[PDB]
Amino acid sequence: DPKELAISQEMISDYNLYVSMVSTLTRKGVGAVETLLRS
């Protein structure tokens, strides 16, 4: 349990950072198309 919780401690946090990173890039991604269509 001290090694299993520790490897699940990283395993939750890195996948939470990955889902926030993939959602912030989608927001700046489509927002760049929005401003380029307004030009």
Binding site: V22, T26, V30, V33, E34, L37
Partner: protein
Amino acid sequence: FYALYFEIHHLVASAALGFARVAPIFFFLPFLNSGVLSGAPRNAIIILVALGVWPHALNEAPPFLSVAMIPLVLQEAAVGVMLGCLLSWPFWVMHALGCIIDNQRGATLSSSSEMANFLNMFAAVVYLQNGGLVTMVDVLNKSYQLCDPMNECTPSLPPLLTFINQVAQNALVLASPVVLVLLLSEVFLGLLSRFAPQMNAFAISLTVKSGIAVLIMLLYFSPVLPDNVLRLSFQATGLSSWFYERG
């Protein structure tokens, strides 16, 4: 009990790419843009629409994991603006129709519009009544059936190059009968200016054309206009001709 947290956590990652596919259709459509929709409940709609249409099963792990993510976003945005410019076809030709009818009668010569907004709202509503959103959702449900990611599909360039004249030849033949009557009336007035020299028939032309431009289009507004609206709506069967996967 780790998989219960992972099932919602694979979902919220899958909806981000689902947002990146279907977000630039909510900018293009006339009844869905930011001018008609606020900011606070917009982003609630765009997520759960892509959640109800996402092709892979939700509990499974997505295949997005560290393949190539920044160019993947530019793939999904490029196919999103492709689906936007195809779905906004009959509103674009109808808004182009009203700009010609506005421009021929005068009333736009302050450059060198409300009427063209009126047809664009009208073809938005008559498209929205019979069916409408069922075929608007069906083409993005088929786009995931023919452009699944980690396959690099593209908007298929060699039929894209005829897109501008494809709406242009639909614009001119739809604006055909009223510019012919306005033009024949102008030269018919010009022969009267040749028969009476100090008439200043240019001033009379603004007074008479605005009555003609609504009168001639009143004869074929009812029985002729609204069926071309349903004819020019882009249907899902032609989705194969605009895309192809690269490996």
